[PDB]
Enzyme design. Sequence first.
Site, mmCIF file in Angstrom:
data_model
loop_
_atom_site.group_PDB
_atom_site.id
_atom_site.type_symbol
_atom_site.label_atom_id
_atom_site.label_comp_id
_atom_site.label_asym_id
_atom_site.label_seq_id
_atom_site.Cartn_x
_atom_site.Cartn_y
_atom_site.Cartn_z
ATOM 1 N N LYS D 41 0.807 -1.226 0.000
ATOM 2 C CA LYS D 41 0.000 0.000 0.000
ATOM 3 C C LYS D 41 0.841 1.277 0.000
ATOM 4 C CE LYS D 41 -1.154 0.261 5.002
ATOM 5 N NZ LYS D 41 -2.319 0.072 5.914
ATOM 6 N N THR D 49 9.857 0.589 8.232
ATOM 7 C CA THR D 49 11.230 0.155 8.477
ATOM 8 C C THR D 49 12.259 1.286 8.342
ATOM 9 O OG1 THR D 49 10.808 -2.182 7.954
ATOM 10 C CG2 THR D 49 13.082 -1.420 7.702
ATOM 11 N N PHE D 122 23.250 -2.142 24.104
ATOM 12 C CA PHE D 122 21.815 -1.981 23.934
ATOM 13 C C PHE D 122 21.106 -2.683 25.081
ATOM 14 C CE2 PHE D 122 20.010 0.195 20.396
ATOM 15 C CZ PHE D 122 18.657 -0.110 20.372
ATOM 16 N N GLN D 243 4.640 -3.717 23.163
ATOM 17 C CA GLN D 243 5.894 -3.080 23.562
ATOM 18 C C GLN D 243 5.725 -1.584 23.811
ATOM 19 O OE1 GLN D 243 10.375 -3.743 22.604
ATOM 20 N NE2 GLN D 243 9.171 -3.895 24.499
ATOM 21 N N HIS D 245 7.903 1.320 24.373
ATOM 22 C CA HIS D 245 9.265 1.845 24.319
ATOM 23 C C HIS D 245 9.437 2.984 25.315
ATOM 24 C CE1 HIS D 245 13.130 2.076 21.980
ATOM 25 N NE2 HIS D 245 13.207 3.153 22.742
ATOM 26 N N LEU D 255 10.014 8.452 18.058
ATOM 27 C CA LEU D 255 10.965 7.614 18.775
ATOM 28 C C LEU D 255 12.344 8.245 18.884
ATOM 29 C CD1 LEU D 255 11.726 4.818 20.088
ATOM 30 C CD2 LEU D 255 12.443 4.169 17.805
ATOM 31 N N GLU D 258 17.002 3.799 21.704
ATOM 32 C CA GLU D 258 17.591 3.184 22.896
ATOM 33 C C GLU D 258 19.116 3.206 22.774
ATOM 34 O OE1 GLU D 258 15.539 0.097 25.085
ATOM 35 O OE2 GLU D 258 17.081 -1.350 24.507
ATOM 36 N N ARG D 289 13.138 -3.525 28.042
ATOM 37 C CA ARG D 289 12.265 -2.456 27.575
ATOM 38 C C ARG D 289 11.033 -2.284 28.459
ATOM 39 N NH1 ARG D 289 14.448 -1.046 22.063
ATOM 40 N NH2 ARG D 289 12.625 -1.582 20.767
ATOM 41 N N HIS D 356 5.090 0.970 20.836
ATOM 42 C CA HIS D 356 6.209 0.840 19.918
ATOM 43 C C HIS D 356 6.087 -0.366 18.991
ATOM 44 C CE1 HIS D 356 10.227 1.403 18.411
ATOM 45 N NE2 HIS D 356 10.654 0.258 18.913
ATOM 46 N N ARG D 400 9.968 -7.875 23.510
ATOM 47 C CA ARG D 400 11.008 -7.850 22.486
ATOM 48 C C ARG D 400 12.262 -7.148 22.986
ATOM 49 N NH1 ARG D 400 11.091 -3.477 19.027
ATOM 50 N NH2 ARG D 400 13.202 -3.284 18.158
HETATM 51 C C1 LIG Z 1 7.863 1.835 14.902
HETATM 52 C C2 LIG Z 1 9.350 1.640 14.920
HETATM 53 C C3 LIG Z 1 9.829 0.337 14.973
HETATM 54 C C4 LIG Z 1 11.197 0.087 15.007
HETATM 55 C C5 LIG Z 1 12.094 1.150 14.988
HETATM 56 C C6 LIG Z 1 11.618 2.461 14.932
HETATM 57 C C7 LIG Z 1 10.245 2.717 14.900
HETATM 58 C C8 LIG Z 1 9.764 4.142 14.843
HETATM 59 N N1 LIG Z 1 13.453 0.897 15.025
HETATM 60 C C9 LIG Z 1 13.933 -0.402 15.073
HETATM 61 C C10 LIG Z 1 15.303 -0.672 15.110
HETATM 62 O O1 LIG Z 1 16.120 0.245 15.092
HETATM 63 N N2 LIG Z 1 15.759 -1.975 15.166
HETATM 64 C C11 LIG Z 1 14.858 -3.022 15.186
HETATM 65 O O2 LIG Z 1 15.243 -4.189 15.229
HETATM 66 N N3 LIG Z 1 13.507 -2.757 15.146
HETATM 67 C C12 LIG Z 1 13.033 -1.458 15.099
HETATM 68 N N4 LIG Z 1 11.669 -1.210 15.069
HETATM 69 C C13 LIG Z 1 10.699 -2.359 15.062
HETATM 70 C C14 LIG Z 1 10.691 -2.942 13.636
HETATM 71 O O3 LIG Z 1 11.591 -2.240 12.798
HETATM 72 C C15 LIG Z 1 9.328 -2.938 12.958
HETATM 73 O O4 LIG Z 1 8.541 -3.969 13.507
HETATM 74 C C16 LIG Z 1 9.529 -3.161 11.460
HETATM 75 O O5 LIG Z 1 9.802 -1.930 10.826
HETATM 76 C C17 LIG Z 1 8.339 -3.821 10.781
HETATM 77 O O6 LIG Z 1 8.785 -4.274 9.528
HETATM 78 P P1 LIG Z 1 7.814 -5.101 8.552
HETATM 79 O O7 LIG Z 1 8.538 -5.391 7.257
HETATM 80 O O8 LIG Z 1 7.347 -6.375 9.217
HETATM 81 O O9 LIG Z 1 6.553 -4.131 8.283
HETATM 82 P P2 LIG Z 1 6.674 -2.594 7.818
HETATM 83 O O10 LIG Z 1 8.113 -2.167 7.712
HETATM 84 O O11 LIG Z 1 5.900 -1.691 8.746
HETATM 85 O O12 LIG Z 1 6.016 -2.575 6.360
HETATM 86 C C18 LIG Z 1 4.638 -2.814 6.194
HETATM 87 C C19 LIG Z 1 4.378 -3.085 4.718
HETATM 88 O O13 LIG Z 1 3.137 -3.739 4.538
HETATM 89 C C20 LIG Z 1 2.381 -3.106 3.523
HETATM 90 N N5 LIG Z 1 0.937 -3.128 3.835
HETATM 91 C C21 LIG Z 1 0.340 -2.916 5.051
HETATM 92 N N6 LIG Z 1 -0.998 -3.036 4.899
HETATM 93 C C22 LIG Z 1 -1.264 -3.325 3.604
HETATM 94 C C23 LIG Z 1 -2.453 -3.546 2.911
HETATM 95 N N7 LIG Z 1 -3.598 -3.081 3.401
HETATM 96 N N8 LIG Z 1 -2.389 -3.826 1.559
HETATM 97 C C24 LIG Z 1 -1.174 -3.886 0.900
HETATM 98 N N9 LIG Z 1 -0.008 -3.662 1.599
HETATM 99 C C25 LIG Z 1 -0.051 -3.387 2.926
HETATM 100 C C26 LIG Z 1 2.918 -1.691 3.402
HETATM 101 O O14 LIG Z 1 2.872 -1.261 2.065
HETATM 102 C C27 LIG Z 1 4.340 -1.797 3.919
HETATM 103 O O15 LIG Z 1 5.245 -1.953 2.853
#
Ligand SMILES: *Cc1cc2c(cc1C)nc1c(=O)[nH]c(=O)nc-1n2C[C@H](O)[C@H](O)[C@H](O)COP(=O)(O)OP(=O)(O)OC[C@H]1O[C@@H](n2cnc3c(N)ncnc32)[C@H](O)[C@@H]1O
Lengths: 138, 102, 239, 613
Positions: D41, D49, D122, D243, D245, D255, D258, D289, D356, D400
């Site tokens: 989307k 990410t 960390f 979680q 944070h 954010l 950490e 955390r 978080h 986590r």
């Molecule tokens: C919130 C957060 C998390 C985070 C972080 C900083 C923030 C602000 N920093 C991290 C870090 O330094 N080190 C680490 O290990 N983790 C950290 N986190 C947690 C972690 O990064 C997150 O859980 C991670 O970013 C999630 O990754 P994931 O690949 O599983 O999902 P996403 O990056 O959020 O991407 C979502 C994708 O799904 C598609 N999507 C969603 N809904 C739909 C529907 N309706 N239809 C079609 N596609 C959909 C989106 O397009 C997106 O690409």
Amino acid sequence: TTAKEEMERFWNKNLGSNRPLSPHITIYRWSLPMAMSICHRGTGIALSAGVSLFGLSALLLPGNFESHLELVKSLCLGPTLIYTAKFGIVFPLMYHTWNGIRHLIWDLGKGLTIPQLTQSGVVVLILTVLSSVGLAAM
Amino acid sequence: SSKAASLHWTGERVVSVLLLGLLPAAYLNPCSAMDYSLAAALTLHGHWGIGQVVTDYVRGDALQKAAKAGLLALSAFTFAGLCYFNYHDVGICKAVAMLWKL
Amino acid sequence: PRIKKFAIYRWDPDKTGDKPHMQTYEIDLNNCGPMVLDALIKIKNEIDSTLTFRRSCREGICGSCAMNINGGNTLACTRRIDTNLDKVSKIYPLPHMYVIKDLVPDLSNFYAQYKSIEPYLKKKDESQEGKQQYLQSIEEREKLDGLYECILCACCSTSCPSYWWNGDKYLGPAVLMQAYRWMIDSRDDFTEERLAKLQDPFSLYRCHTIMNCTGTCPKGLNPGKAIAEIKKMMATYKE
Amino acid sequence: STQYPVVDHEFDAVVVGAGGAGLRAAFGLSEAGFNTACVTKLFPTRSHTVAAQGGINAALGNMEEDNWRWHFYDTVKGSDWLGDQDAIHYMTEQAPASVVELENYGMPFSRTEDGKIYQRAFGGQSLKFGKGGQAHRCCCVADRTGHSLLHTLYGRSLRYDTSYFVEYFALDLLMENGECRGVIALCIEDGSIHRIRARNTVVATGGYGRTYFSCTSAHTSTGDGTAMVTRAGLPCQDLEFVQFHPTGIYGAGCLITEGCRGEGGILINSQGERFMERYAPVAKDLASRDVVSRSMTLEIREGRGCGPEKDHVYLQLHHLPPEQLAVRLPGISETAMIFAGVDVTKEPIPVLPTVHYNMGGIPTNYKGQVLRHVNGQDQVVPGLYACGEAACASVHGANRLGANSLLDLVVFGRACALSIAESCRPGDKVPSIKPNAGEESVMNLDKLRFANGTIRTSELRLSMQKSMQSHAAVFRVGSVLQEGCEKILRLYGDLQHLKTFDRGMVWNTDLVETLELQNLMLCALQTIYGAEARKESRGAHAREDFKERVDEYDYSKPIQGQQKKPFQEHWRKHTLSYVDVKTGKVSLEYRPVIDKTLNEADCATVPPAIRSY
Ligand SMILES: *Cc1cc2c(cc1C)nc1c(=O)[nH]c(=O)nc-1n2C[C@H](O)[C@H](O)[C@H](O)COP(=O)(O)OP(=O)(O)OC[C@H]1O[C@@H](n2cnc3c(N)ncnc32)[C@H](O)[C@@H]1O
Ligand code: HEM
Ligand SMILES: O=C(Nc1ccccc1)c1ccccc1C(F)(F)F
Ligand code: SF4
Ligand code: F3S
Ligand code: FES
């Protein structure tokens, strides 16, 4: 799909559509470094129009240069009006020359920050005025 | 691949520093040899200059080629006109000198 | 009680024969966040839910909310609203872009150009990859500072007049800076052939050093300086 | 339905999501010669990410000598023993191999004097199985590691011929007789409905942090895969574990890494005293955390606030040399000044524990295979995989550990790819689907598009966000969680009343955020009911009425003459949640935690013990 194939589809999608282009010059906020760039193109075009007119008239107009100056003398040579003619001829040439140096310093990689562009930009403007007034009276 | 674009770019900047060299050199030493140098450097730098304007604004297959051919003629005419002026008339340096103390 | 006026560019592709027009909205800034996006979502949520824009992180990274605010291309989630009530904030979509709807531009070409430069590490023999970490000294790494941070918001490329008049064949600052990123990456073995891709009139040489790119970057980066640094490499690399 | 044009697509594999997880799974499939589609989307780069800033954990041993088995111990301990050790074994072993993979792809990691990947301390990590002090294994790209991780993966993803469906919103799973056949999706660009079918489906839609009023998550973190799996009648897992944070900015909730605390950052209350020294004697503010943010919320409770409202805490950075802040943490340096107007080098940041990460999600194998729960036993859902934050192999359990999800992303994206590439071959029979298939996803789309109701999509969304924020926070009691349940249940009935204004096809953001609301609600219901039923305190989930950690044995005193508690008497088990889409009722059964590793000889099981830092 390749990068080239994508661009081909981008243009075929939009040109064959009713999507409007977002405004550009109309809306964009004008800055000194920006305004000074168009002026470099303007002065460049004006000067080439000067050189080309001067060259082609040597081939298309009768009589030598010495006789052509007598035509300028014929229409009363105003004291202020002759200085303005010299200023309006040197003004675009001096701007483009000084800014050319600024363009050539850039190509060496030097002086490419926004603060520097404002500083060096102003220095061109001041050098243009002074050298335009200075040469117009010689 | 060839370095056809990068060579053209460097050439542009070379004649620029050459033309920036000639303006003070022509004032301090106004002569026959400085007239042709200032004619060659002037028309060339200008010809490449308008070329950059043409490539930026002239859109199309038939038009882009045509404008380029138009510019090639006009600039060649400009160089021929200046050379004639240097050979059969006062010569640009002296011509500027005459026009100025007027 | 403290009202601020917002003039926003609007267009509906689904409405029959509708053409671009500005619609004004009023917002009590006391019930609002400091940034432009906060106001954008506020009118979207409370006044008019027909308002269409891209957003995600509200943080200044993702690069979704890139648009022309008050004349300069930035990020709505980073730019704060001018509290001056007498002034009226003019919100436009990125310049010289095909508008899909309201403030949502078609960035497909932009993305595709980024694909054409190959923004990935390339070794002469990738037969040993995925087992050893490549060595890069602290200094070789600092060359990437100011380059890697790019977020592909397309604010810079959309401020460049060269990209307006020649967007089809000119790669633009954003894409060019990333090509420079991979050029001076010590781990990359394709430095010469990457420069060779730019050997034509349009791809690189449509830059005339207008400096609207560097001036507008919401991340403080300097794309033009990199372009000028490319031009130098293009002129000095042998064979 | 004959007002909507339907276009069918045929593939070998579908990956829903283009984040960290999605991409690695997406191009990993194509690398293995599969005709793969990636539905997303957002534009891949815009995925959440990018926001990542802490780092990515691997026992590379660049700073001090390290063993991956120590990283194993810290993860399972951090998980408060709800973490399935078979998948923790798998991940922590792969860790070094996975990070090196990324560095060779072109990720611009920070560098040591040797010239290797820079790592630093960390919260929650130790050497010698806890006995050897603080461990430095967080691999980072200065302060923008997640941003670089996403761009490097996307950079690489371009080398293969994956067919990307950019800005396509996945509606539901194409389910048929307990088997997944693909996804049905809306094309945001021209409002067209697309049925993408394949032999294997991978879900990497990330978390659902938008169920709350204040969170570090993006506006696009709406748990859309969680809802898709729910609507298919499949169980979700551990959704009550959310979680919090410790260090999110007081304003917009952004954010602040950490890594700040890992580079020597300090947490401080109104009195000036470093409060984290009293709560955690050994590890201090570089502890778990859930424990740090628990202490933060507790200092606010007891009058020791900070600002004019006295409702937040400080993160101090004055004492750290300016050059360290510029090299290690330039990302926060800018965003602390932008949002809180704080000059990091001179003043401290107003921080507050905010939502978080979602460790709950879709029940998963260590191989990425989505599990359903039949007759008290595990069962593999055919052609369905999930990875990342959207999934729950429960590598993270009840809490986590920092810098482990970016790891989780890359390791398990790769897992899903290899788990497919070694179960079937490309060019195999793509299972056919009914002409009716995905009918009520389209019919749901139609109703929400023309929804002439009485409650605005935004007004109901806020009502849901404030309700979760005040009823399912850091601390939660029975009675408070109870009120949140029938309040949240009433709001599901309020989904029948919603008003939508935009009637357009092209880029109806009014409509997609309404679809997202249904998604968030289904995630909210399972979070709140699952939490209220769980009568113990474990990791992120902390009950005031049930302070104890309820396991099979009382693990404080040694197990010998002690008698086992039956499965349905303790809480050392995974919470599985369902919901009937019509009445919005949450029914919940359970499944046991996996304690056997992949190899006892190579990685010895870690039994439960008192866990404090
Ligand atoms: C919130 C957060 C998390 C985070 C972080 C900083 C923030 C602000 N920093 C991290 C870090 O330094 N080190 C680490 O290990 N983790 C950290 N986190 C947690 C972690 O990064 C997150 O859980 C991670 O970013 C999630 O990754 P994931 O690949 O599983 O999902 P996403 O990056 O959020 O991407 C979502 C994708 O799904 C598609 N999507 C969603 N809904 C739909 C529907 N309706 N239809 C079609 N596609 C959909 C989106 O397009 C997106 O690409
Ligand atoms: C000796 C003084 C001069 C210097 C130092 C100079 C330098 C330059 C430079 C460096 C550029 C390219 C700008 C860029 O980087 O994009 C330029 C552009 C140009 N110049 Fe000059 N120049 C001088 C005099 C002249 C003269 C006398 C003429 C008249 C024939 C002229 C005509 C042009 C034209 C037509 C352009 C094209 C503008 C464009 O790039 O579109 N210049 N000049
Ligand atoms: O092209 C421009 N001048 C230019 C071109 C080549 C070399 C120097 C200046 C320019 C510069 C700044 C702002 C607007 C413009 C434009 F709108 F297009 F007119
Ligand atoms: S260089 Fe700056 S303006 Fe251009 S895409 Fe990158 S962050 Fe955006
Ligand atoms: S706005 Fe422009 S033409 Fe070059 S210096 Fe920047 S890309
Ligand atoms: S929304 Fe992420 S940059 Fe504005």
